[PDB]
């Protein structure tokens, strides 16, 4: 289920979420623990999820550093995440 998420730094704080990289069977940008009150929680982010897009940039096979870079570059960017896209991997 392709989910949509828009992160915008309206105040002066990050999004509130982390990201991890998957194995070789399914490499990509995953979502890690998130902090409450931040934008991440406001959008409905959490561990297991998997970002498959960010401001147009396909995160299907985007490098880990690339994900953090683009996310760090633009404070406010639209990120397309798909539920279970990462949970499958987490289930180790």
């Amino acid at each position: 289920k392709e989910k949509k998420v828009f992160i915008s730094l309206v105040g002066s704080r990050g999004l509130g979420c982390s990201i991890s990289s998957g194995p070789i069977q399914k490499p990509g940008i995953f979502i890690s623990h998130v902090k409450p009150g931040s934008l991440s929680a406001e959008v409905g982010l959490e561990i297991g999820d998997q970002i498959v897009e960010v401001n147009g940039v396909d995160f299907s096979n985007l490098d880990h550093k690339e994900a953090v870079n683009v996310l760090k570059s633009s404070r406010s960017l639209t990120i397309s995440i798909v539920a279970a896209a990462g949970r499958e991997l987490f289930m180790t």
């Binding site: 982390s18 991890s20 990289s21 995953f30 953090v68 760090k72």
Partner: peptide, 8 residues
Amino acid sequence: TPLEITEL
């Protein structure tokens, strides 16, 4: 081993 993680 656990996968790399980053804080945003």
